[PDB]
Design a protein around this nucleic acid. Sequence first.
DNA 1: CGGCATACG
DNA 2: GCCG
Length: 326
Amino acid sequence: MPAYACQRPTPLTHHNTGLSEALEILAEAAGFEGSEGRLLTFCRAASVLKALPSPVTTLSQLQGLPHFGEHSSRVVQELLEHGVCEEVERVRRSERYQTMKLFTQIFGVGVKTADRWYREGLRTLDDLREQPQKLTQQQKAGLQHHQDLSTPVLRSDVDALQQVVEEAVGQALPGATVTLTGGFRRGKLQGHDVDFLITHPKEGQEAGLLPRVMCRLQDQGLILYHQAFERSFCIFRLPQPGSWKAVRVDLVVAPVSQFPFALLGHTGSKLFQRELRRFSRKEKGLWLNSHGLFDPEQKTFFQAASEEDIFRHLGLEYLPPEQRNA
DNA sequence: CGGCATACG
DNA sequence: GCCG
Ligand SMILES: O=c1ccn([C@@H]2O[C@H](COP(=O)(O)OP(=O)(O)OP(=O)(O)O)[C@@H](O)[C@H]2O)c(=O)[nH]1
Ligand SMILES: [Cl-]
Ligand SMILES: [Cl-]
Ligand SMILES: [Mg+2]
Ligand SMILES: [Mg+2]
Ligand code: NA
């Protein structure tokens, strides 16, 4: 079991779901309390269990597994012995956890904003609606559409949205392409949004593209909210039987030279990308982001034609998106 | 002990 | 919280 999540395949479904969910509760709570380090350890330990080939049944099976020390091992032991971990249950039913979860799940509300509102005494969505002077326009949008945005996006929803994005993209710049990324590219059957990556085969033609896309979508009445730019975090109007629902849609534009890096960077998982960037820097001395891969000694960028190129650059076995579910 | 991913809106 |  290698130490970095990018060094091992992680399927979407696995053999330790209950154990990983418990550890991810503690990771989420650690983040709510400002401890990025503890969040990462608990996320990594959870991901190790996702990568195992069969269920953990005994504590001895944790020996030698990376990122399992006293705390994470204690959590797993209690779950194996009693089917429940007291620390996890205490977090679950704590007012702090439940409110930070409710608040951060809002589009436009992060941990720092949620924490301040918590300290000010706010607890519910109606508490926020009852004081709208304190909200940004983005947060007003996230709060107005909160109910729809709390409904899982389905794979059927994805196909319809890609068609309308392609239509708008085709008018905005003929020959431009739309690639599904994010969790649905990793094989998820549901999601909190739909993520797309847009490019054009002739380097440079993608410049200025996204404003032209957004203006056309807005003209077709399909944009319930959006902000030169190359990323947009929007809320789309998605038709439904006799009605419609709001759906979060992310659009990213990249030049074709950077497309492999942007595809890798936006396909995830979030933990997979963090681990891959950490691996690249700490083990290989290379700086990775969604634009490229930089050698800070030679002051050069690696040219990649594919995700396969990037894995090979970093000396890692290639992992298809479906195996990046760290 | 230091480190913990990344850049755009 | 854990790794090196
Ligand atoms: O903090 C973050 C968030 C996102 N991302 C990058 O953006 C991608 C999309 O980020 P999303 O937030 O849309 O997550 P997701 O598609 O993986 O899962 P859903 O909750 O949407 O179902 C991620 O998969 C990752 O590549 C990061 O690198 N860091
Ligand atoms: Cl590998
Ligand atoms: Cl770390
Ligand atoms: Mg997504
Ligand atoms: Mg997204
Ligand atoms: Na949020």
